[PDB]
Amino acid sequence: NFNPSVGSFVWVEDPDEAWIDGEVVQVNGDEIKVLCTSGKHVVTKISNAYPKDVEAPASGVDDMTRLAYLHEPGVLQNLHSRYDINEIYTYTGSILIAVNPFRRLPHLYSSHMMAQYKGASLGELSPHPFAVADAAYRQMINDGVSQSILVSGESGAGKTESTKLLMRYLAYMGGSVEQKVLESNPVLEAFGNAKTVRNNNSSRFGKFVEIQFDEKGRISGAAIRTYLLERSRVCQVSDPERNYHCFYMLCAAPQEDVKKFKLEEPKKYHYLNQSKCLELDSINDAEEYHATRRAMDVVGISTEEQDAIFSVVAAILHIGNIEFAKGEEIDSSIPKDDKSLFHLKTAAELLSCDEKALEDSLCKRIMVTRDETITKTLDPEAATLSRDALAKVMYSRLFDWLVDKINSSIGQDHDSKYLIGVLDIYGFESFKTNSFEQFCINLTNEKLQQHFNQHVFKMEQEEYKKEEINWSYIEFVDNQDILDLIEKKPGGIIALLDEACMFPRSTHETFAQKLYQTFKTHKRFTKPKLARSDFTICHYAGDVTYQTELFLDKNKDYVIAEHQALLNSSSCSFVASLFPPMSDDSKQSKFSSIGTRFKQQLVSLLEILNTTEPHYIRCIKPNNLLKPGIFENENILQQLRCGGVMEAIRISCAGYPTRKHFDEFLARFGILAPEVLVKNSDDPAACKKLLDKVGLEGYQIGKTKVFLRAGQMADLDTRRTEVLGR
Ligand SMILES: Nc1ncnc2c1ncn2[C@@H]1O[C@H](COP(=O)(O)OP(=O)(O)O)[C@@H](O)[C@H]1O
Ligand code: ALF
Ligand SMILES: [Mg+2]
Ligand SMILES: [Mg+2]
């Protein structure tokens, strides 16, 4: 076991900074007194203490499994040391660990650096996402099976940056399709990314990039898949956060390019004024407009199609400045001041429709009756809800048109045999107020971590028990019950939300009370005492309390009748093309459920990833100030524990990554030792004896399969290739 010396350096617990560095000064029977470099003297039992590796280089260890002292402080200190010398990447078994640098490293990601990793093995070079990308490319041809790379972490930990690296390297192995997949990121980030408290350039939509490869290995096609874009940001923004980049790009654009839009300072427009943050130090909005147009030309978006897109973006900004006051008649709406009539006229001119038809779209809805057509009027509060509804649907139809035009140039089938898919989702985020959009984001992260848990801890250890192997079970925290809490078919938070959405005039307190009487006897569900309509979920990353105030509203997906009627009446080809013409030999739907639609998309994505061989990259956010050179133990310790990094190191150190059937084993490696006899095609004793003849040790013989350590299968294929070639 462990026995501390009278004078030695050990790790001890501390209220802050997690573990602290100390030196024992006194030794009792079972307790010891440590002395930290800080000077404080702590007293604790020996079992709480952990030995410290004094002989540790600043470079640390490239693999956490090769660490001399496997425990939490050594993992934390190995990470910290490599972070100080700008070595952000580090391996854990086959998994890659990435700590956010929060600074530019041009040499670490140059195209020359790609050539260095072109033929490199996973462990030959220093850890890098290019090595994970190459591993996915090599394992695709050696197996003929599709691959997928899965990037995880909390919000702002570097998933989107990590995905850009994988795409730049994957385009290098198959190489005009390559250029357009790389230029699709700036276009989508202009309309799907915005500043939050967690990330200055936070992804508000999840993407799944699919790279197609033919049998020869060329990049035949590529496709991008986007999931639940947040459109509520268009209308309501918190003070720290910012609206989508496109709005600020257009206000910083050269005046001759946007002279027709009649744009003002950003602080004037209602959809941006709520934030009170209009500029970013890390983002130059003027350059982003020039970069986005440049990227749009690469994808093939016509310059005339670019003008109509920005006309919609500038129109949405004008629409937000249309205030409503009480009309002369009861429950009537009218523009408040003459400035709202300016914006109402401008937004109609930018949308190529009638100014009065636009005004009648927000102030007055029409009731549907077979006997005659009647028009009611709206109160100012109802009219405000009608203009915010118009903007959201206009922005999502615009964002969806982009993803359709992107794949209309880079998406095609050349009868390819397999693909590689890198997955970029939104990270687990928690704010002082948590809406329905957060509920789906954290659900997505919850589902991805379960996939990690299954393919790393559940499926691996079931085989170990199945094969009668000598093995100590490694316990872990499973989040399956949280998934059953949300997407259970016979009553889940998603399923219950559709129930309350069917009943008209259902308040958020009724859906709230329904959650309490149903999930009362549950471990992962909690209710705040003073909050009637707020519910808390014990997420794997931490407790998050949600507000159901807007849950029923965010879930219903519908198109306002007079909204689609106006947008269809537009003289501009692009504006009318944003809404499909329904009701002509077509079915009319009351509303569609976003919760079930998003759940269905999440299951289909999971089923495609279950047919591919996965590769994991765990991103880590080192600090919350979004600045470099700040390594915080508490932030990183809580991410390692809830992410299961400690258990993964334990499974990678003692586990067996590769297993082959006896018949597959004697066929390939029986040629290594011709003198070793074999009784039949699947004889287990020959496997034991053929491995001893080669000199391998630590292997384990199972019920029906052999089990080898991380690098033991690799040298057997190299030994085989040498003898068969001779
Ligand atoms: N490899 C990297 N090189 C440079 N900056 C990085 C890198 N990874 C992350 N960052 C920084 O972290 C920020 C957030 O990263 P991002 O990919 O947006 O995380 P997430 O997708 O999880 O929100 C970036 O805007 C950038 O400043
Ligand atoms: F932009 Al994120 F998690 F915050 F992908
Ligand atoms: Mg992102
Ligand atoms: Mg929404």
Author numbering: 4 to 178, 186 to 736
Give me lines lifted from the publication on this model.
Although class XI myosin is the fastest myosin class in the myosin superfamily, the atomic structure of the class XI myosin MD has yet to be solved. We chose Arabidopsis myosin MYA2 (AtXI-2) as the crystallization target, because AtXI-2 has a standard velocity among class XI myosins, it is faster than most animal myosins, and its ATPase activity is more stable than those of Chara myosins. AtXI-2 has an amino acid sequence relatively similar to that of CbXI-1 MD, having 63% identity and 87% similarity. We succeeded in solving the crystal structure of AtXI-2 MD bound with ADP and AlF4− at 2.8-Å resolution, which is the first atomic structure of the class XI myosin MD. Fig. 4 C and D show comparisons of the structure of ADP·AlF4−–bound AtXI-2 with the structures of other ADP·AlF4−–bound classes of myosins. Although there are some deviations in the position of the main chain, the nucleotide interaction region including switch I and switch II is almost identical. The backdoor size for phosphate dissociation of AtXI-2 was also very similar to those of myosins of other classes. Thus, the structure near the nucleotide-binding region of myosin XI was not markedly different from those of myosins of other classes (myosin II, myosin VI, and myosin XIV). The estimated angular angle of CcXI is 85 degrees, which is similar to those of pig myosin VI, Scallop myosin II, and Plasmodium myosin XIV. This result suggests that the magnitude of the angular change in the converter domain is not related to the fast velocity of class XI myosin.
Myosin XI produces an intracellular flow known as cytoplasmic streaming in plant cells by moving on actin filaments while binding organelles via its tail domain. The velocities of myosin XI are generally high, and the molecule specializes in cytoplasmic streaming. In contrast, plant-specific class XI myosins have velocities of 5 µm s−1 or higher.
